[PDB]
Design a protein around this ligand. Structure first.
Ligand SMILES: CO[C@H]1O[C@H](CO[C@H]2O[C@H](CO)[C@@H](O)[C@H](O)[C@@H]2O[C@@H]2O[C@H](CO)[C@@H](O)[C@H](O)[C@H]2NC(C)=O)[C@@H](O[C@@H]2O[C@H](CO)[C@@H](O)[C@H](O)[C@H]2NC(C)=O)[C@H](O[C@H]2O[C@H](CO)[C@@H](O)[C@H](O)[C@@H]2O[C@@H]2O[C@H](CO)[C@@H](O)[C@H](O)[C@H]2NC(C)=O)[C@@H]1O
Lengths: 148, 141
């Protein structure tokens, strides 16, 4: 049984594995921030079905950390995710996701968070049809599922 | 400059180092529990005022406490207990505080790997975060 090509994951081995590849396009992403600054702590990916129901996952933000702010990625009708990039660095003695950018066929959304630490970038070829990685209190790792 | 004899510590490398050796006798120990059960999450050592609390660094709410009251002619002499897994953490599961008079405990659930010290206990040290990762004693004969 064939399975979608994984790019990455990028990051480290903390937290718990997570995966989300819905059968319908991911049209909305919420970046949750903590600590009063631009510190990403959680990601929500959602895909709205024709009937009004949503496929959704939230990863990271597994702790008591108060959500202090959110940013959103809105993916339009003739828009689709093509690439991701960002940085992994230290947030409160944790090597985690520090910034993230979501590229579509139409624009780059972001940067979301703080451009600090070790950078990573997906291969510029392609459609991103899902995400996977590791998370706990924050986002420990992230990669993509891909289909050309 | 001499320093008091350390026994142990026992446990693992989790959490942060802690240490408490007061010049006044430790007369009370509070054992804090979490998750509605017999699961120790924090230890408070207090002197006749010197005090420390170790563990309980999480949002985990305290669901109960128990107390050792050390008598005026009583003093700590040994410790023992177990370490094991509590919510994906290899931490302290039970502890017994022995004095010249009696063993106090056990406090918690006697599950996991046992330990026991080989005297007066004059303080404690260890590692802690959300729970108690390690524990040992300062000693003076
Ligand atoms: C529920 O408590 C656990 O998770 C705490 C947060 O760490 C999680 O999130 C990060 C980032 O996403 C991730 O990398 C971790 O793996 C962990 O996720 C958990 O992963 C395990 C599998 O590994 C999985 O089973 C769990 O489901 C998953 N949790 C969730 C909610 O999904 C963690 O506290 C963090 O621990 C790391 C070191 O592992 C540390 O760097 C972080 O600074 C610290 N976070 C915070 C907010 O303090 C919990 O562990 C605590 O307490 C334990 C018990 O006493 C200790 O053994 C741990 O070491 C840690 O204490 C911290 O220790 C570091 C030094 O090691 C010290 O700098 C901190 O001060 C101290 N914390 C305190 C309060 O003193 C526990 O794993």
């Amino acid at each position: 049984v064939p399975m979608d090509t994984i790019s990455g994951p990028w990051g480290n081995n903390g937290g718990n594995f997570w995966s989300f590849r819905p059968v319908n396009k991911i049209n909305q992403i919420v970046i949750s921030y903590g600590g009063g600054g631009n510190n990403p702590i959680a990601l929500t990916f959602s895909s709205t079905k024709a009937d009004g129901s949503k496929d959704t996952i939230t990863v990271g933000g597994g702790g008591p950390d108060s959500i202090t702010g959110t940013e959103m990625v809105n993916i339009g009708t003739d828009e689709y995710l093509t690439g991701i990039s960002g940085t992994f660095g230290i947030y409160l003695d944790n090597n985690v996701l520090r910034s993230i950018t979501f590229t579509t066929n139409l624009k780059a959304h972001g940067p979301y968070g703080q451009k600090v630490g070790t950078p990573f970038s997906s291969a510029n070829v392609n459609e991103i049809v899902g995400f996977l990685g590791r998370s706990g209190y924050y986002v420990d790792a992230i990669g993509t599922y891909n289909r050309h």
